Amino acid sequence: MNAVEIISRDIYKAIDIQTKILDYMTKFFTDRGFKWLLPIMLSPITDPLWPDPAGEGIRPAEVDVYGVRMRLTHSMILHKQLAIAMGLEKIFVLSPNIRLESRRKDDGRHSYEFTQLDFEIEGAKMKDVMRLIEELIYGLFRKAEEWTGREFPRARHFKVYDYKDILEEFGSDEKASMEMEEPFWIVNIPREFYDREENGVWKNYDLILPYGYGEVSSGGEREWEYEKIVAKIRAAGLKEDSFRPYLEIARAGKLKPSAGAGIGVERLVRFIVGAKHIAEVQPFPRVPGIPAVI
Amino acid sequence: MNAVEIISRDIYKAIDIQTKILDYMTKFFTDRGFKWLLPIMLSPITDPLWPDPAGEGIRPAEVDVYGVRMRLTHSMILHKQLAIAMGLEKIFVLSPNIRLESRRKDDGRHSYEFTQLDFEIEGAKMKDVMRLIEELIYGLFRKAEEWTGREFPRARHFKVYDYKDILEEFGSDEKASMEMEEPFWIVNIPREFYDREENGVWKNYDLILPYGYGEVSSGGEREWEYEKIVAKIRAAGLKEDSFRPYLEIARAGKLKPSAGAGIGVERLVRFIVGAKHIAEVQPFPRVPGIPAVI
Ligand SMILES: NC(=O)C[C@H](N)C(=O)O
Ligand SMILES: NC(=O)C[C@H](N)C(=O)O
């Protein structure tokens, strides 16, 4: 698809819906006393996105900034924790992410650029955040019925599956998605160092959409203790130097217990519009493995 | 400032103000039927930021995406025009920009990463957009008086000066800002190819804050005709090759007349908080010429 073909697509309704979704979600958080932060795109530190069952172990793209190697934002997870450490209590941000995954990840819900609504809560536990996301989704699905005139999932009860039980019953998260008619949770997933692990139990959670639409939100309680964090980094084969300033703050004892999640905005627009491929809801597609012409 | 130094600051008040500003500005536009788009950060094309009297002629940060050179967003100007070409009529986006300006631009209002509330309106004229920005600013200042209990400029409309005359009377926009006690407009500034020029008159506008706070918004009517656009790019010594997909769309006759502006969110936060340096209102400072540690 050349440049003219890209801008000749019809996208009005999707953008109409996206506008209503953004209005709804931003107000959801400000109404609850969340502070609205602005994103950062370049930093010496960023989400490693590894280890992770849902990743390929890609390294973030880098750019020289005044002679210093900066990483482009994989996710603002580390900066969220730092905002909690500055005492901002409850924060969210509409955060663009850059994740240069291969053609293999071009499954209809992945995009190499996209936005999470990314939020974090000092002192929160996994059950608090899951309950919060459930309330957000329920409210959204009820509004969406008014906007579209179509029926959406009842959204009051979300079943919880342990990761290992997902592997046992369906084989993978994608296949579970294809089999459900209601959104559901997957919990206890071994991944990045920042998610809290206690006695071999990971205090994290992915919200999965039904009808094969796949993951739409992921989060967890966080590690905040330097010793615990460093061990996990070293064990995964990541370099401590890659996280130097974060680890300094960890060492100073300035990280606080917290929990949060990110919600993929375009993935929600896709679900509500009912689009087969997420590119259909983006004015300027960013398809994995395909460098955008515009 | 080093890592622990940065997270030790108390910017709670500034962030609380920012939250109220973002809520007010986003509602302003959605109330008026604007569509809310998400930002792009990587593209083959971006704003050249040249010619421009406010600039020193910086080159965009660049990174490879699947072997293809992409530019980090200087601004989404060209994409705003493309959004109008897709028939979205009235659009805005909370758009992060990366502008790696020199230490010479560390004047208290510049940041090498920042967000513009960037909007565009099909068919609009400069007077229309100026009037819309006046409505937004006046309304925001009344709300700010309630939030802070302090007084803000009360003008409902702002005086208008030609760029040429500013130079003659004050020497510079910076010096003009220091002498004024309400916001004011500077119009007719020869700059980038995308601003509409007619018979030597540029249909563009900068809103300047008083008390030395400087520019807070810049905008213009746009060029839409292929031949005019190419001539301007060539006259400035820029390369058509740098805008190829955009120029394909212009050649196809698909750009439409429009007008718009971007408004610096952090710059407005700084003004309402009364901060000497914009860094004081940012959780993760991005000072021109100084690579941030986080
Ligand atoms: N993987 C991610 O993007 C992190 C996620 N946003 C979280 O809050 O944990
Ligand atoms: N200088 C810029 O970033 C362009 C501005 N946002 C406009 O709309 O004209």
TrEMBL record, chains A, B:
The lineage of its organism: Archaea, Methanobacteriati, Methanobacteriota, Thermococci, Thermococcales. InterPro entries: Aa-tRNA-synt_II (IPR004364), aa-tRNA-synth_II (IPR006195), aa-tRNA-synth_II/BPL/LPL (IPR045864). AMP 1 binds at residues 99, 101, 111, 114, 116, 215-216, 264. Mg(2+) 2 binds at residue 215. Residues 89-283 form the Aminoacyl-transfer RNA synthetases class-II family profile domain. This is AsnS-like asparaginyl-tRNA synthetase related protein. PANTHER family: ASPARAGINYL-TRNA SYNTHETASE-RELATED PROTEIN (N-TRUNCATION), ASPARTYL/LYSYL-TRNA SYNTHETASE. Keywords: Aminoacyl-tRNA synthetase, ATP-binding, Ligase, Metal-binding, Nucleotide-binding, Protein biosynthesis. Mg(2+) 3 binds at residues 215, 218. One of its GO terms (molecular function) is ATP binding. GO terms for biological process: asparaginyl-tRNA aminoacylation. PROSITE patterns: AA_TRNA_LIGASE_II.
